[PDB]
Design a binder for this molecule. Structure first.
Ligand SMILES: O=P(O)(O)O[C@H]1[C@H](OP(=O)(O)O)[C@@H](OP(=O)(O)O)[C@H](OP(=O)(O)O)[C@@H](OP(=O)(O)O)[C@H]1OP(=O)(O)O
Ligand SMILES: Nc1ncnc2c1ncn2[C@@H]1O[C@H](COP(=O)(O)OP(=O)(O)OP(=O)(O)O)[C@@H](O)[C@H]1O
Lengths: 989, 293
């Protein structure tokens, strides 16, 4: 069994089979540097059964700048690097049996001990020993998965080898999509006519299965390979011998295993199959591979990395690279700049790049033991050459170590950029997984650690949850129900004692703009968002636009992720995006004509809403508005209409008084939901009715219902009855016990209940007077408890009730049911997530932050979109700002604002004339927010021109200025009003 | 001459401004009249795009210029004095339909992303959610139309941020929802239009809709008029009071013609009795209606 309260989000990504394969898997990892630590952290968060970390070198003062778990005590005691982190690593996940090893590694070492493990990861190890290990691992039966990852300065390298033949059980991990069929042609070959609209979006060679096809009863349950003909047709095999086709049809895609091939490490070095990440330089990965191979040969021949700024070392490395390149099969050209920068930053180490590579490698490791996605084939060369390219030709003395924790970062990006990093006032929004990883990156980079200046502000109103511990590594099981921001601030200080963090519990929204005023944003230097919803992102972006501050955005959905870089006066904003509107289920589909399990799940969710949240609130509001029920009766007797009075008075008459009445109510609701509805729908539309075209009204995607008679012996019926009874008892505030919920007790209760057979003012008055006579009008009767949808708590019965209702409705519509977890995901809109993608996007966002702080030109900034399922990583230039012209050659961008000043007798015509005089164009309408101030066509506004600003807007004394929006008449009649940049106006000077 | 006078008088009241929402000194939204989309208005951000304001202003220009107006049917729009996204619409039912001369009130709220998304329209004259005036007008007040993306239809029939306009929405409501035979608006019964059983079902539906219209669309609108349209409602009813009497008498006679049916006779009798009671109440109210200024 898998505890869902901790791995729910990961199960929504990997699935049960992948989880089971992850258990009973033993992973060996060598090299406890920064990259190795990141890989181990991601794996132990994933939930591997046992991980063995191996390292032979001892702790050094240089390791503090790359390791976020070491302390000064470890350096003082000269502890082994693997042992010094063993205790902290196990704290991330008690289910993982983490072990440490320190056996020496060399050519003469007995390497047969690796056969116990299933996946070996090598880091910071010599190349020839990697060759030997990879030769051994791939020759085992079964093969042992091999992954090599390294980071040298700002250049990385990743390699995979899952044997000569490896089989993946899921090519992409995307759920199959259901396709509707319109016509089948009895010919050789057959031709499929897809349903109207709804393109199938398939590819030739796939396997498709068909079901619910009238006529070809033999084609139901069969699997046929397709041949794409058009976006709405494809070709199937022989169907001539079959019976003709009437109507209907459903086709879904069938996943099939795929076999990929890998080559040995010693053979890949002579002609690698790299992965392209930047299409502007397709040949870049091969050149990077050549440079790093030259670096390894230099390390072999000199037993040391090249010194910083040494001319002879650079010349030797260039000569080695030139010699190596001509021996390659493709004969590439040695990139002088790449080799020069590799020599310059050979001894350095970059933290965000290490984190990104660690996330990718951990994802590959997860692929290795499960076969869940297509593995990387066969190299990956991430790099951050843009960091140093803008630096020109810095002096070697700037990169020299000084004897502090930041020696590694200084050796990469020079002393000046390191100092400018330590003096950043950066505002971080949200403290989710991405927020925690970004705080870790801040601690490793020393952001805002200077005494004089530097301040990190992190705000998040949520509390820590058990499911958050899987993805947010800064938290512990004893931190549950504590504030996220405070816990993160306390934990980050442990990593770096010099950090200066301010944690706020406030949300980020218009209601809280009084504290995050314009001065606060001006104080900040870069804003990073770790949000999870689009409205907050848009609000933050709009706030940043009004203050001209850089913004970095990121977001992950399962194995997918994206980053965006926004720079004032250079790029477009987040609000500039116009995504297409999403498809939404119409009212007819949801209410009466469902076709997929999602429709029934949504119907169950909003039925729960109406039954236990909306209507109880209406009841409470109505009865608190009119305290005296007798007064309500008097008003009704005098003909006074009231809002929802009939509905509420009907609710009062059916209010249960004890557990037995709650069980009866549950039975009645079950009958109403799943027996009466189908009968009345079939009565309205008989199954045999025809349309003008001759098609049956119940043609696809509509599905004919069928009544479900109650049966307590059915597990689903009993589950629904129990959950509905519990929810009704809780809502109506009556006690109950566990034995009252037993099957026998329920049988004894509803056995005597009669069931109604399927078929206002006076009734309301009768019910109200009967209730008054029966004394069912006390202050407890006029109140009803309201419930909230708590999906995360499994003992409240919300998810069980929703699942039972959705499954019953699906059974009514002959749709196959769904398991509890799928209903939990869909109804609660739980976004799938995992640690690897969040770590990777955090590393990339940190690199973008370095770029923004450096003040680099527009070409340096890169937006990234990655999907580890394929896997693909795409870097594209951020969209540049667009000049928008209006009239007379006047043009403006999204970052432009205009300013005007007025006085006491400043009238509306004065303001319009001032803007016309200043910018040469006449404003035609002025609006603050959603309040209109001048619209000539609207009646009652022509006389507004004389009105002064203070009378027109009636402003508050809090601010002397108000932000306005203007528009201008089109240069050609018949066109809409030209847009205009926002204008800020001051009531005085 | 009566129709010309009605057109001349009603034209001055087609478009106007009323104070629906006023802000107190603290800064909260106070509502002076009932509104269906109150919750979304309270949660509307102040980061409104200037494009939305421009589109609303142009729509206001179009509404003030070319709103439909005739004796058979008319449209009246009231906009908030300080918020372009608050609007109430009163539509008089076209003649020769069960909705004829009935005043129907609507609440329209424009979303923050407008015109990317169609404006939200909700019927208010639902009679306390007890009457389903049309297959596309559910008893809860939801309006189903293709142009509002709430109904199945072609892409050209769906909401278009560049070409679709609110005036088109109003015209579509008038020409598609308040039709002569609302029973056939349902996408399943329209294939039996003209058949005897379909005709009988349409007659029953028309009788029910007529009784509901007399009960709610005019009786409750004259007894408890909304503050926004009060003058419009009073003037309209005073001008057309004789036509209301003639229409009610004709409806009573027509529904009593089929009261002897062997299949729906009981429902016909019930609807006829309810219609007669509503007609008597309407007679009383119209007799008590003073002459508007
Ligand atoms: O409030 P809703 O979520 O729209 O559900 C209602 C509700 O049923 P429940 O109270 O059992 O959820 C109605 O019953 P009342 O509370 O108004 O008495 C019922 O009306 P009927 O009594 O006429 O069945 C109606 O069903 P319908 O619209 O088919 O008349 C049904 O609507 P849904 O279940 O489709 O939401
Ligand atoms: N307007 C906002 N202001 C501040 N923080 C916000 C705002 N909106 C969202 N957040 C925060 O953004 C974070 C997003 O992180 P994450 O994806 O882990 O969320 P979650 O709700 O904890 O996750 P899950 O949905 O898996 O339970 C949340 O912790 C939430 O508190």
């Amino acid at each position: 069994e898998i505890d869902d309260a901790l791995y729910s989000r990961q199960r929504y990504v990997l699935g049960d089979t992948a989880m089971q394969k992850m258990a009973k898997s033993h992973v060996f990892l060598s090299g406890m540097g920064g990259l190795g630590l990141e890989i181990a952290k991601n794996l132990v968060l994933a939930g591997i059964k046992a991980v063995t970390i191996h390292d032979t070198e001892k702790c050094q003062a240089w390791d503090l700048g790359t390791n976020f778990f070491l302390s000064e005590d470890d350096v003082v005691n000269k502890r082994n690097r693997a042992e010094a982190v063993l205790k902290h690593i196990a704290e991330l996940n008690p289910y993982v049996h983490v072990t440490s090893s320190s056996v020496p590694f060399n050519e003469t070492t007995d390497l047969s001990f690796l056969d116990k493990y299933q996946c070996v990861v090598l880091t910071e190890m010599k190349l020839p020993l990697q060759k030997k290990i990879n030769d051994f691992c791939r020759s085992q039966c079964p093969p042992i998965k091999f992954i090599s990852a390294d980071v040298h300065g700002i250049w990385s390298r990743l390699f995979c080898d899952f044997g000569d033949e490896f089989e993946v059980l899921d090519t992409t991990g995307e759920e199959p999509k259901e396709i509707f069929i319109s016509n089948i042609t009895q010919a050789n070959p057959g031709i499929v006519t897809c349903l109207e609209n709804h393109p199938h979006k398939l590819e030739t060679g796939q396997f498709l299965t068909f079901r619910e096809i009238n006529g070809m009863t033999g084609l139901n349950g069969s699997i046929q390979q397709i041949t794409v003909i058009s976006p709405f047709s494809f070709s199937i095999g022989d169907t001539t011998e079959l019976e003709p086709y009437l109507h209907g049809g459903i086709a879904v895609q069938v996943k099939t295993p795929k076999t990929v091939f890998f080559e040995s490490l010693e053979r890949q070095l002579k002609h690698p199959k790299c992965l392209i990440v930047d299409f502007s330089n397709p040949e870049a990965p091969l050149e990077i591979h050549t440079a790093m191979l030259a670096l390894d040969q230099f390390q072999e021949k000199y037993s040391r990395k090249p010194n910083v700024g040494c001319q002879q070392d650079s010349e030797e490395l260039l000569k080695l690279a030139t010699s190596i390149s001509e021996t390659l099969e493709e004969k590439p050209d040695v990139n002088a700049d790449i080799v020069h920068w590799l020599s310059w930053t050979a001894q350095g180490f970059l933290s965000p790049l290490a984190a990104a590579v660690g996330g990718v490698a951990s994802q590959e490791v997860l692929k290795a033991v499960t076969g869940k996605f297509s593995p990387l084939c066969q190299w990956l060369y991430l790099e951050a050459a843009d960091i140093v390219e803008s630096l020109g030709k810095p002096e070697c003395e700037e990169f020299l170590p000084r004897g502090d924790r930041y020696d590694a970062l200084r050796a990469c990006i020079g002393d000046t950029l390191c100092q400018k990093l330590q003096n950043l006032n950066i505002f971080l929004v949200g403290c989710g997984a991405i927020g925690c990883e970004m705080l870790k990156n801040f601690a490793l980079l020393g952001v805002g650690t200077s005494k004089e200046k530097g301040m990190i502000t992190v705000t998040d109103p949520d509390l820590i949850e058990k499911s958050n511990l899987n993805r947010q590594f800064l938290f512990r099981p004893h931190h549950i129900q504590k504030p996220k921001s405070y816990t993160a601030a306390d934990a980050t200080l442990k990593i770096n004692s010099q950090i200066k963090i301010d944690a706020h519990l406030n949300k980020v929204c218009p209601t809280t703009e009084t504290i995050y005023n314009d001065e606060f944003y001006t104080k900040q230097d870069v804003i990073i968002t770790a949000l999870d919803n689009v409205e907050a992102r848009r609000y933050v972006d709009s706030r940043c636009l009004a203050n001209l501050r850089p913004l970095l955005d990121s977001g992950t959905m399962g194995t997918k992720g994206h980053t965006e870089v926004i720079v004032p006066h250079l790029t477009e904003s987040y609000n500039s995006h116009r995504d297409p509107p999403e498809e939404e289920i119409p009212f007819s589909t949801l209410k009466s004509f469902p076709a997929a399990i999602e429709h029934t799940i949504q119907w169950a969710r909003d039925k729960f809403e109406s039954s236990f949240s909306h209507k109880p609130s209406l009841f409470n509001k109505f009865w608190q508005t009119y305290s005296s029920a007798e007064e309500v009766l008097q008003k009704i007797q005098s003909g006074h209409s009231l809002e929802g009075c009939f509905q509420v008075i009907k609710l009062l008459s059916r209010r249960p008084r004890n557990w037995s009445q709650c069980v009866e109510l549950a039975r009645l609701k079950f009958e109403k939901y799943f027996n009466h509805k189908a009968l009345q729908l079939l009565h309205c539309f008989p199954l045999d009715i025809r349309l003008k075209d001759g098609s049956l009204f119940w043609q696809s995607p509509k599905r004919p219902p069928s009544p479900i008679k109650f049966d307590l012996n059915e597990p689903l019926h009993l589950s629904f009855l129990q959950n509905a009874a519990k929810l009704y008892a809780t809502v109506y505030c009556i006690p109950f016990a566990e034995e009252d919920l037993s099957a026998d007790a329920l049988l004894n209760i509803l056995s005597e209940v009669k069931i109604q057979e399927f078929k206002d003012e006076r009734n309301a008055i009768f019910q109200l007077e009967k209730a008054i006579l029966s004394n069912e009008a006390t202050k407890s009767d006029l109140q009803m408890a309201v419930l909230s949808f708590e999906k995360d708590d499994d003992h409240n019965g919300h998810i069980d009730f929703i699942t039972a209702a959705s499954n019953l409705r699906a059974k009514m519509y002959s749709i196959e049911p769904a398991d509890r977890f799928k209903t939990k995901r869909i109804a609660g809109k739980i976004i799938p997530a995992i640690a690897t993608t969040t770590a990777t996007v955090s590393g990339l966002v940190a690199l973008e932050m370095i770029k923004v702080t450096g003040g680099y030109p527009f070409e340096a900034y890169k937006n990234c979109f990655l999907n580890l399922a394929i896997p693909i990583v795409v870097f594209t230039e951020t969209t540049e700002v667009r000049k928008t012209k209006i009239r007379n050659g006047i043009s403006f961008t999204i970052w432009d604002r205009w300013t005007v000043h007025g006085k006491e007798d400043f009238t509306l015509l004065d303001f319009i004339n001032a803007v016309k005089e200043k910018y040469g164009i006449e404003p035609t309408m002025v609006v603050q927010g959603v309040k209109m101030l001048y619209v000539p066509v609207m009646p009652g506004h022509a006389k507004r021109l004389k009105l002064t600003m203070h009378k027109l807007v009636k402003p508050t004394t809090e601010k002397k200025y108000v932000d306005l929006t203007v528009s201008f008449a089109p240069d050609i009649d018949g066109d809409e009003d030209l847009p205009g940049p926002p204008v800020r106006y001051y009531f005085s000077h | 001459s009566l129709e010309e006078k009605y057109v001349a008088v009603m034209k001055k009241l087609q478009f106007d401004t009323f104070e629906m929402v006023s802000e107190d000194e603290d800064g909260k939204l106070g509502f002076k009249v009932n509104y269906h989309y109150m919750s979304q208005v309270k949660n509307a951000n102040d980061a409104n795009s200037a494009a939305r304001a421009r589109r609303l202003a142009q729509e206001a220009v179009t509404l003030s210029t070319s709103l439909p107006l005739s004796s058979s049917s008319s449209v009246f729009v009231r906009c908030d004095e300080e918020r372009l996204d608050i609007m109430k619409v009163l539509i008089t039912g076209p003649a020769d339909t069960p909705y004829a001369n009935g005043c129907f009130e609507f609440d329209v709220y424009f979303p923050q992303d407008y015109p990317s998304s169609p404006p939200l329209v909700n019927l208010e004259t639902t009679g306390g959610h007890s009457v389903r005036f049309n297959p596309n007008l559910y008893n809860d007040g939801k309006v189903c139309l293709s142009i509002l993306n709430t109904w199945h239809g072609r892409p050209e029939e769906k909401w278009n941020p560049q070409t679709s306009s609110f005036l088109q929405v109003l015209v579509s409501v008038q020409s598609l929802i308040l039709v002569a035979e609302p029973y056939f608006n349902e996408p399943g019964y329209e294939r039996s239009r003209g058949t005897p059983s379909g005709t009988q079902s349409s007659r029953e539906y028309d009788g029910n809709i007529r009784q509901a219209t007399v009960k709610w669309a005019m009786l409750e609108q004259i007894r408890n008029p909304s503050p926004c349209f009060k003058e419009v409602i009073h003037k309209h009813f005073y001008l057309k009071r004789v036509e209301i009497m003639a229409q009610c008498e004709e409806w009573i006679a027509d529904i009593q013609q089929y009261s002897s049916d062997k299949r729906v006779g009981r429902t016909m009798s019930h609807h006829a009795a309810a219609l007669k009671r509503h007609t008597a109440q309407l007679r009383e109210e119209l007799l008590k209606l003073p002459c508007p200024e």
